[PDB]
Protein backbone atom coordinates (compact mmCIF):
# COMPACT_ATOMS: atom_id res chain seq x y z
CA UNK A 1 0.00 0.00 0.00
CA UNK A 2 0.95 3.71 -0.43
CA UNK A 3 0.30 6.99 1.44
CA UNK A 4 -3.35 8.15 1.07
CA UNK A 5 -2.22 11.54 -0.41
CA UNK A 6 -0.16 9.94 -3.25
CA UNK A 7 -3.17 7.70 -4.04
CA UNK A 8 -5.51 10.81 -4.02
CA UNK A 9 -3.43 12.92 -6.43
CA UNK A 10 -3.18 9.87 -8.83
CA UNK A 11 -5.94 9.78 -11.48
CA UNK A 12 -7.76 6.38 -11.40
CA UNK A 13 4.03 6.32 -9.76
CA UNK A 14 6.54 8.41 -11.80
CA UNK A 15 10.14 7.77 -10.64
CA UNK A 16 11.85 10.88 -12.14
CA UNK A 17 9.00 13.34 -12.52
CA UNK A 18 9.58 17.08 -12.53
CA UNK A 19 13.28 16.67 -13.55
CA UNK A 20 13.38 19.89 -15.64
CA UNK A 21 12.15 22.07 -12.75
CA UNK A 22 13.95 23.68 -9.81
CA UNK A 23 11.92 24.30 -6.68
CA UNK A 24 12.91 27.02 -4.18
CA UNK A 25 11.78 26.41 -0.60
CA UNK A 26 11.56 29.45 1.72
CA UNK A 27 11.23 27.71 5.08
CA UNK A 28 13.00 26.66 8.37
CA UNK A 29 16.51 25.04 8.43
CA UNK A 30 16.61 21.66 6.58
CA UNK A 31 18.23 18.28 7.43
CA UNK A 32 20.12 18.04 4.10
CA UNK A 33 21.73 14.68 5.18
CA UNK A 34 18.33 12.90 5.59
CA UNK A 35 18.24 9.86 3.31
CA UNK A 36 14.83 10.98 1.95
CA UNK A 37 16.09 14.30 0.49
CA UNK A 38 19.91 13.74 0.41
CA UNK A 39 21.33 15.00 -2.89
CA UNK A 40 17.93 16.43 -3.96
CA UNK A 41 18.07 19.63 -1.90
CA UNK A 42 20.80 22.26 -2.26
CA UNK A 43 21.17 24.39 0.88
CA UNK A 44 21.85 27.97 -0.24
CA UNK A 45 23.99 30.32 1.93
CA UNK A 46 20.78 32.37 2.56
CA UNK A 47 19.55 32.97 6.09
CA UNK A 48 17.40 35.87 7.28
CA UNK A 49 15.60 35.00 10.51
CA UNK A 50 14.35 36.76 13.64
CA UNK A 51 15.64 35.70 17.09
CA UNK A 52 13.73 32.93 18.91
CA UNK A 53 11.30 34.06 21.63
CA UNK A 54 11.88 33.00 25.25
CA UNK A 55 14.25 33.16 28.25
CA UNK A 56 16.75 30.51 27.01
CA UNK A 57 15.81 28.78 23.79
CA UNK A 58 17.56 25.47 23.08
CA UNK A 59 18.58 25.25 19.42
CA UNK A 60 18.11 21.54 18.73
CA UNK A 61 18.81 20.65 15.07
CA UNK A 62 16.12 17.93 15.10
CA UNK A 63 13.40 20.41 16.11
CA UNK A 64 14.72 23.45 14.11
CA UNK A 65 14.66 21.39 10.84
CA UNK A 66 11.28 19.62 11.29
CA UNK A 67 8.89 21.75 9.17
CA UNK A 68 11.30 22.25 6.22
CA UNK A 69 12.65 18.62 5.96
CA UNK A 70 9.08 17.31 5.81
CA UNK A 71 8.09 19.83 3.11
CA UNK A 72 11.20 19.03 1.02
CA UNK A 73 10.22 15.34 1.21
CA UNK A 74 6.58 15.92 0.16
CA UNK A 75 7.89 17.76 -2.93
CA UNK A 76 10.74 15.45 -4.07
CA UNK A 77 11.36 12.74 -1.46
CA UNK A 78 13.08 9.50 -2.56
CA UNK A 79 10.18 7.31 -1.28
CA UNK A 80 7.15 9.50 -0.54
CA UNK A 81 7.69 12.55 -2.77
CA UNK A 82 5.38 13.93 -5.46
CA UNK A 83 8.10 14.92 -8.00
CA UNK A 84 10.93 12.39 -7.38
CA UNK A 85 13.11 13.93 -10.13
CA UNK A 86 12.89 17.60 -9.17
CA UNK A 87 15.81 19.68 -7.95
CA UNK A 88 15.30 21.83 -4.83
CA UNK A 89 17.16 24.80 -3.36
CA UNK A 90 16.31 25.95 0.19
CA UNK A 91 16.58 29.38 1.83
CA UNK A 92 16.15 29.82 5.58
CA UNK A 93 13.48 32.51 6.34
CA UNK A 94 11.84 30.78 9.38
CA UNK A 95 13.60 30.32 12.76
CA UNK A 96 13.43 27.21 15.09
CA UNK A 97 9.93 28.21 16.23
CA UNK A 98 8.60 28.60 12.65
CA UNK A 99 8.70 32.43 12.71
CA UNK A 100 10.05 34.80 10.09
CA UNK A 101 9.51 38.36 8.84
CA UNK A 102 8.09 40.12 5.76
CA UNK A 103 11.48 41.80 5.21
CA UNK A 104 13.29 38.42 5.44
CA UNK A 105 10.82 36.88 2.97
CA UNK A 106 11.36 39.81 0.51
CA UNK A 107 15.20 39.53 0.80
CA UNK A 108 14.68 35.78 0.08
CA UNK A 109 12.43 36.36 -2.94
CA UNK A 110 15.03 38.85 -4.30
CA UNK A 111 17.88 36.26 -3.77
CA UNK A 112 15.95 33.72 -5.91
CA UNK A 113 15.66 36.20 -8.78
CA UNK A 114 19.37 37.21 -8.52
CA UNK A 115 20.33 33.47 -8.59
CA UNK A 116 18.27 32.89 -11.70
CA UNK A 117 19.82 35.84 -13.60
CA UNK A 118 23.41 34.78 -12.71
CA UNK A 119 22.87 31.06 -13.59
CA UNK A 120 19.64 30.27 -15.49
CA UNK A 121 18.30 26.67 -15.52
CA UNK A 122 14.71 25.50 -16.48
CA UNK A 123 11.40 26.72 -15.09
CA UNK A 124 11.44 27.72 -11.40
CA UNK A 125 8.70 26.93 -8.86
CA UNK A 126 8.83 28.91 -5.57
CA UNK A 127 7.16 27.27 -2.55
CA UNK A 128 6.18 29.69 0.34
CA UNK A 129 4.74 27.51 3.12
CA UNK A 130 4.26 30.53 5.36
CA UNK A 131 1.72 33.27 6.23
CA UNK A 132 1.35 36.62 7.89
CA UNK A 133 -1.31 39.32 7.75
CA UNK A 134 -2.14 41.15 4.47
CA UNK A 135 1.04 42.83 3.20
CA UNK A 136 1.11 45.35 0.37
CA UNK A 137 4.92 44.90 -0.01
CA UNK A 138 4.83 41.02 0.07
CA UNK A 139 2.00 40.88 -2.50
CA UNK A 140 3.89 43.36 -4.73
CA UNK A 141 7.16 41.30 -4.56
CA UNK A 142 5.21 38.08 -5.34
CA UNK A 143 3.43 39.77 -8.30
CA UNK A 144 6.78 41.06 -9.64
CA UNK A 145 8.42 37.59 -9.48
CA UNK A 146 5.39 35.97 -11.16
CA UNK A 147 5.44 38.62 -13.93
CA UNK A 148 9.19 37.85 -14.42
CA UNK A 149 8.14 34.27 -15.38
CA UNK A 150 8.49 32.46 -12.01
CA UNK A 151 5.67 30.19 -10.66
CA UNK A 152 4.79 30.84 -6.95
CA UNK A 153 2.83 28.48 -4.63
CA UNK A 154 1.69 29.46 -1.08
CA UNK A 155 -0.30 27.93 1.75
CA UNK A 156 -3.83 29.44 2.16
CA UNK A 157 -3.28 29.61 5.95
CA UNK A 158 -4.36 27.50 8.91
CA UNK A 159 -6.65 30.09 10.54
CA UNK A 160 -10.15 28.88 9.35
CA UNK A 161 -10.51 32.36 7.91
CA UNK A 162 -10.76 34.25 4.64
CA UNK A 163 -7.35 33.84 2.87
CA UNK A 164 -7.63 37.43 1.46
CA UNK A 165 -6.66 38.77 4.97
CA UNK A 166 -3.35 36.80 4.78
CA UNK A 167 -0.15 37.25 2.75
CA UNK A 168 1.22 35.94 0.46
CA UNK A 169 -2.09 33.99 0.26
CA UNK A 170 -3.94 37.14 -0.93
CA UNK A 171 -1.49 37.90 -3.84
CA UNK A 172 -3.57 37.03 -6.96
CA UNK A 173 -0.62 36.03 -9.22
CA UNK A 174 0.24 33.26 -6.69
CA UNK A 175 -1.39 29.82 -6.61
CA UNK A 176 -2.90 29.69 -3.11
CA UNK A 177 -3.54 26.21 -1.72
CA UNK A 178 -6.08 25.19 0.94
CA UNK A 179 -5.91 21.74 2.60
CA UNK A 180 -8.34 18.70 2.51
CA UNK A 181 -8.27 15.29 4.37
CA UNK A 182 -8.70 11.53 3.40
CA UNK A 183 -12.48 12.07 3.12
CA UNK A 184 -11.96 15.15 0.78
CA UNK A 185 -13.23 17.49 3.53
CA UNK A 186 -11.52 20.73 4.68
CA UNK A 187 -8.78 20.10 7.27
CA UNK A 188 -9.46 21.01 10.88
CA UNK A 189 -6.34 21.87 12.93
CA UNK A 190 -7.20 22.12 16.63
CA UNK A 191 -9.87 24.82 17.03
CA UNK A 192 -8.85 26.36 13.64
CA UNK A 193 -8.14 24.74 10.20
CA UNK A 194 -7.68 25.45 6.46
CA UNK A 195 -8.34 28.95 5.11
CA UNK A 196 -10.98 29.52 2.38
CA UNK A 197 -12.59 32.17 0.13
CA UNK A 198 -12.06 33.83 -3.29
CA UNK A 199 -8.24 34.02 -2.80
CA UNK A 200 -7.86 30.18 -2.73
CA UNK A 201 -7.18 28.54 -6.08
CA UNK A 202 -7.64 24.86 -5.17
CA UNK A 203 -7.26 22.29 -2.38
CA UNK A 204 -4.86 19.36 -1.97
CA UNK A 205 -4.12 16.72 0.74
CA UNK A 206 -3.04 18.41 3.96
CA UNK A 207 -3.82 15.98 6.78
CA UNK A 208 -1.71 12.98 8.02
CA UNK A 209 0.88 13.41 5.22
CA UNK A 210 3.79 10.95 5.50
CA UNK A 211 7.08 12.81 5.04
CA UNK A 212 10.71 12.97 6.17
CA UNK A 213 11.22 13.36 9.89
CA UNK A 214 14.31 15.11 11.29
CA UNK A 215 14.23 12.87 14.46
CA UNK A 216 16.61 10.46 12.64
CA UNK A 217 18.29 10.22 9.14
CA UNK A 218 15.70 7.66 7.89
CA UNK A 219 12.59 8.56 10.00
CA UNK A 220 9.09 9.36 8.65
CA UNK A 221 6.35 11.42 10.40
CA UNK A 222 2.82 12.48 9.40
CA UNK A 223 2.16 16.25 9.38
CA UNK A 224 -0.87 18.47 8.71
CA UNK A 225 -1.40 21.97 7.37
CA UNK A 226 -1.90 24.14 4.29
CA UNK A 227 1.96 24.16 3.84
CA UNK A 228 1.74 20.34 3.24
CA UNK A 229 -1.06 20.96 0.71
CA UNK A 230 1.04 23.69 -0.95
CA UNK A 231 3.99 21.20 -1.23
CA UNK A 232 1.70 18.77 -3.14
CA UNK A 233 0.86 21.56 -5.62
CA UNK A 234 4.52 22.62 -6.06
CA UNK A 235 5.27 18.95 -6.94
CA UNK A 236 2.28 18.66 -9.32
CA UNK A 237 3.18 21.95 -11.01
CA UNK A 238 6.79 20.69 -11.45
CA UNK A 239 5.53 17.52 -13.18
CA UNK A 240 3.15 19.51 -15.42
CA UNK A 241 5.90 22.05 -16.30
CA UNK A 242 8.48 19.28 -16.79
CA UNK A 243 6.15 17.49 -19.26
CA UNK A 244 5.06 20.79 -20.95
CA UNK A 245 7.91 23.31 -20.44
CA UNK A 246 6.52 26.08 -22.72
CA UNK A 247 3.46 26.55 -20.42
CA UNK A 248 2.85 30.14 -19.34
CA UNK A 249 1.62 30.83 -15.73
CA UNK A 250 -1.99 31.18 -16.90
CA UNK A 251 -1.79 27.96 -18.93
CA UNK A 252 -0.41 26.15 -15.83
CA UNK A 253 -3.31 27.43 -13.67
CA UNK A 254 -5.83 26.04 -16.18
CA UNK A 255 -4.09 22.61 -16.20
CA UNK A 256 -4.33 22.49 -12.38
CA UNK A 257 -8.06 23.31 -12.52
CA UNK A 258 -8.79 20.91 -15.41
CA UNK A 259 -7.10 17.86 -13.83
CA UNK A 260 -8.47 18.55 -10.28
CA UNK A 261 -11.30 16.44 -8.79
CA UNK A 262 -14.48 18.56 -8.81
CA UNK A 263 -17.35 18.88 -6.31
CA UNK A 264 -15.89 16.41 -3.73
CA UNK A 265 -15.70 19.00 -0.86
CA UNK A 266 -18.83 19.52 1.33
CA UNK A 267 -19.19 23.32 1.23
CA UNK A 268 -21.23 23.21 4.50
CA UNK A 269 -17.86 23.28 6.49
CA UNK A 270 -17.08 26.87 5.34
CA UNK A 271 -19.22 29.83 6.54
CA UNK A 272 -22.46 30.39 4.55
CA UNK A 273 -21.17 33.31 2.35
CA UNK A 274 -17.87 31.59 1.53
CA UNK A 275 -19.43 28.52 -0.19
CA UNK A 276 -20.00 30.22 -3.60
CA UNK A 277 -16.62 32.02 -3.34
CA UNK A 278 -14.58 28.90 -2.48
CA UNK A 279 -13.43 26.76 -5.43
CA UNK A 280 -14.46 23.10 -4.94
CA UNK A 281 -11.30 21.60 -6.47
CA UNK A 282 -8.89 18.94 -5.12
CA UNK A 283 -5.50 18.83 -6.96
CA UNK A 284 -4.52 15.80 -8.99
CA UNK A 285 -1.91 14.82 -11.59
CA UNK A 286 -2.78 14.26 -15.28
CA UNK A 287 -2.58 10.72 -16.84
Amino acid sequence: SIPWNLERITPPQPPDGGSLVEVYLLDTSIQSDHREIEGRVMVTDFENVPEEDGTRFHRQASKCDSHGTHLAGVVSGRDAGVAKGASMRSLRVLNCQGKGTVSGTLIGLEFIRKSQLVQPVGPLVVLLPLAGGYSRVLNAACQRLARAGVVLVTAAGNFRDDACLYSPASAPEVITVGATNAQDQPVTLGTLGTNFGRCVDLFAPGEDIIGASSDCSTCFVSQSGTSQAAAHVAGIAAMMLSAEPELTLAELRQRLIHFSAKDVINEAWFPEDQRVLTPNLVAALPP
Binding site: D27, T28, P50, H67, V93, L94, G98, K99, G100, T101, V102, S103, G104, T105, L106, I107, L109, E110, R113, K114, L117, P129, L130, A131, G132, G133, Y134, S135, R136, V137, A140, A141, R144, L145, A148, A155, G157, N158, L165, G225, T226, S227, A230
Partner: protein, 92 residues
Protein backbone atom coordinates in the same frame (compact mmCIF):
# COMPACT_ATOMS: atom_id res chain seq x y z
CA UNK B 1 0.66 60.69 -2.41
CA UNK B 2 3.16 58.31 -0.68
CA UNK B 3 1.49 56.19 2.01
CA UNK B 4 2.23 54.35 5.29
CA UNK B 5 1.03 50.84 6.10
CA UNK B 6 1.28 48.45 9.06
CA UNK B 7 -0.07 45.00 9.96
CA UNK B 8 -3.77 44.91 10.97
CA UNK B 9 -2.96 42.02 13.42
CA UNK B 10 -1.37 44.17 16.17
CA UNK B 11 0.64 41.34 17.95
CA UNK B 12 2.16 40.44 14.51
CA UNK B 13 3.60 44.01 14.18
CA UNK B 14 7.36 44.55 14.35
CA UNK B 15 7.82 48.28 15.12
CA UNK B 16 11.14 50.00 14.45
CA UNK B 17 12.01 48.36 11.09
CA UNK B 18 10.47 49.74 7.92
CA UNK B 19 10.42 48.76 4.26
CA UNK B 20 10.72 51.89 2.13
CA UNK B 21 9.38 51.04 -1.31
CA UNK B 22 10.24 53.33 -4.27
CA UNK B 23 8.52 54.04 -7.60
CA UNK B 24 8.43 51.22 -10.19
CA UNK B 25 11.51 52.07 -12.40
CA UNK B 26 13.81 53.46 -9.66
CA UNK B 27 17.44 52.48 -10.29
CA UNK B 28 19.73 50.94 -7.62
CA UNK B 29 21.91 54.09 -7.72
CA UNK B 30 18.87 56.21 -6.79
CA UNK B 31 17.62 53.76 -4.05
CA UNK B 32 21.06 54.08 -2.46
CA UNK B 33 20.89 57.92 -2.75
CA UNK B 34 17.42 58.00 -1.13
CA UNK B 35 18.58 55.81 1.80
CA UNK B 36 21.57 58.15 2.32
CA UNK B 37 19.13 61.13 2.10
CA UNK B 38 16.97 59.55 4.83
CA UNK B 39 20.08 59.09 6.98
CA UNK B 40 21.30 62.72 6.54
CA UNK B 41 17.76 64.16 7.21
CA UNK B 42 17.37 61.92 10.31
CA UNK B 43 20.86 62.86 11.56
CA UNK B 44 19.98 66.59 11.22
CA UNK B 45 17.08 66.02 13.67
CA UNK B 46 19.17 63.86 16.05
CA UNK B 47 17.94 60.44 14.94
CA UNK B 48 20.15 57.38 14.33
CA UNK B 49 19.15 55.12 11.46
CA UNK B 50 20.63 51.92 10.03
CA UNK B 51 20.20 50.79 6.43
CA UNK B 52 19.90 46.99 6.75
CA UNK B 53 19.68 46.18 3.04
CA UNK B 54 19.02 47.88 -0.32
CA UNK B 55 16.61 46.10 -2.65
CA UNK B 56 16.84 45.71 -6.47
CA UNK B 57 15.77 43.05 -8.98
CA UNK B 58 12.11 42.91 -7.95
CA UNK B 59 11.11 46.07 -5.98
CA UNK B 60 13.32 49.16 -5.63
CA UNK B 61 13.89 50.31 -2.05
CA UNK B 62 15.59 49.61 1.27
CA UNK B 63 15.12 48.14 4.73
CA UNK B 64 15.70 50.70 7.53
CA UNK B 65 15.91 50.34 11.35
CA UNK B 66 14.70 53.68 12.73
CA UNK B 67 12.22 55.52 14.96
CA UNK B 68 8.67 55.73 13.63
CA UNK B 69 8.95 59.49 14.38
CA UNK B 70 10.80 59.76 11.03
CA UNK B 71 7.92 58.40 8.89
CA UNK B 72 6.27 61.81 8.04
CA UNK B 73 9.69 62.95 6.77
CA UNK B 74 10.53 59.60 5.05
CA UNK B 75 7.24 59.76 3.08
CA UNK B 76 8.32 63.17 1.62
CA UNK B 77 11.61 61.79 0.17
CA UNK B 78 11.87 61.88 -3.64
CA UNK B 79 10.94 58.64 -5.51
CA UNK B 80 9.04 57.12 -2.50
CA UNK B 81 5.93 55.02 -3.41
CA UNK B 82 4.97 53.69 0.07
CA UNK B 83 6.38 52.56 3.45
CA UNK B 84 5.35 49.43 5.36
CA UNK B 85 6.23 48.51 8.92
CA UNK B 86 7.85 45.01 9.21
CA UNK B 87 5.68 42.15 10.52
CA UNK B 88 5.73 38.40 11.30
CA UNK B 89 5.27 35.42 8.98
CA UNK B 90 4.62 31.86 10.29
CA UNK B 91 5.15 28.25 9.22
CA UNK B 92 1.87 26.73 7.99
Amino acid sequence: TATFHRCAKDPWRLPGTYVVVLKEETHLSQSERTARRLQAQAARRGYLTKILHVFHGLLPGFLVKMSGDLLELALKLPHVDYIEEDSSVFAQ
